[PDB]
Write a protein that binds this ligand. Structure first.
Ligand SMILES: C/C(=C/C=C/[C@@H](C)C(=O)O)[C@H]1CN[C@H](C(=O)O)[C@H]1CC(=O)O
Ligand SMILES: C/C(=C/C=C/[C@@H](C)C(=O)O)[C@H]1CN[C@H](C(=O)O)[C@H]1CC(=O)O
Lengths: 248, 253
């Protein structure tokens, strides 16, 4: 049986291929996740239809506790797998089963080069330089729930003034960093990608936490473990590292 | 019901406490893993008896496909959990269920300071400097199964001459590095611990792979997921990071 794979567009994980004529099916996409997906499909032996998540969201829960995006697709069994830079979080792992991480990363700071700023603490102590994150993303949630003083303070600032310091998506954040005096709290894997394509930007400090991206499956899914094992196999033989180098 | 926790002695994960009189039970140990364990027990609400694995091995399989150590304890249901720097590997994950990693790391190089060597490649190209790893550990296995040229070459050297380049345990490896012209392939978390207490030693290059340590449970265990969720919780609130700092920090160099 063909597995339905729910995903979302995000450089360089899942992107529309470049072609002179209209593309159809899986042929529409390319990227690290499509490469990962075909590696997993060879190892486990399954066919799949990549399908973009209808609402274009990763998955968060509203005030009433209902989920949206890819997480929701898995919960309602509208998809068998979720392959994308879907951060393994406490709140998400309770409603869906994650495979072991296929990429590890952390929350860090994207800012422009040649400045005295060097840590999340430097930012927390002032207000001249504005800073924030993608609204409702795992990074924002981290700062929202943290009880570490420095992070509590930063959240106080990010959420103030109607969350004007937050951005809707990564691209809006990057442009905001390139144009104004703004710093973006962003996942390290994404910062590496960006700083490699824009010499004006750089990472500030190191990681302020350790996270991973995993393949999502519905709770009780028989593939969860098979995928985990395949990921470990791909990691141990250098394929994951090879794939990262290819797209980064 | 009290859960039986199988573990092994390894600084600074599980160590014998220092005391004037004989110690008994869980009171015998201290370390990062005992701290982790009590955090998990508070969150999940269970009691536990720490018990050192009888044969003192982590878990590898012999030629007949038989497992030993902690992995074996879990397979035969002699323990409910395995809490130790037990590397999550392909071969192990097939016989036991692992929680999500509570610590991520990689294979790196422990060598002495002030030398021209700077990468696994530098080592692979020569033979003056001897190098190896703990025999039968996950690191050795990595090199044994790799098909990457540089690692294939290093394995060729490590396994040659009856594996004389390999060591029985981390301490033998560290002493060998401090005394002779030898480099030790070792997990990054352990290198950090050592270099912080030995200003003569240092890490060479970065990580040559990405691994994690996880709590082990028997296949089909009802705790696997509960523990995973608790670990994510502890990570998200800074406790795992806090615990690492508590046991890793040295006295400066
Ligand atoms: C790039 C990104 C955007 C998320 C946007 C959310 C608000 C959504 O549209 O559902 C994701 C990638 N991984 C994080 C997550 O899974 O939450 C998030 C980025 C981040 O939060 O740093
Ligand atoms: C310090 C260590 C010693 C393992 C010794 C094996 C040969 C044993 O006696 O069971 C462990 C720590 N994590 C690895 C593992 O889980 O296999 C191994 C060290 C390593 O292989 O680099």
């Amino acid at each position: 049986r063909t597995l339905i794979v729910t995903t979302i567009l995000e450089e360089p994980y899942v992107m529309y291929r470049k072609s002179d004529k209209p593309l159809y099916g899986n042929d529409r996409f390319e990227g690290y996740c499509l490469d990962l997906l075909k590696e997993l499909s060879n190892i486990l032996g399954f066919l799949y239809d990549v399908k973009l998540v209808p609402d274009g969201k990763y998955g968060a829960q509203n005030d009433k506790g209902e989920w949206n995006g890819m997480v929701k697709e898995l919960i309602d069994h509208r998809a068998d797998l979720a392959v994308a830079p879907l951060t393994i979080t406490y709140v998400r792992e309770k409603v869906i089963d994650f495979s072991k991480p296929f990429m590890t990363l952390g929350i860090s700071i994207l800012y422009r080069k040649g400045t005295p700023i060097d840590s999340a603490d430097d930012l927390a102590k002032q207000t001249k330089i504005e800073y924030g994150a993608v609204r409702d993303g795992s990074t924002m949630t981290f700062f929202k729930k943290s009880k570490i003083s420095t992070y509590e303070k930063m959240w106080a600032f990010m959420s103030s003034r109607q969350q004007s310091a937050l951005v809707k998506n990564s691209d809006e954040g990057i442009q905001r960093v390139l144009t104004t005096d703004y710093a973006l709290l962003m996942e390290s894997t994404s910062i590496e990608y960006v700083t490699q394509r824009n010499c004006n930007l750089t990472q500030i400090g190191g990681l302020i936490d350790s996270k991973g991206y995993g393949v999502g499956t519905p709770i009780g899914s028989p593939y969860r473990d098979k995928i985990t094992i395949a990921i470990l196999q791909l990691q141990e033989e250098g394929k994951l590292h090879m794939m990262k180098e290819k797209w980064w």
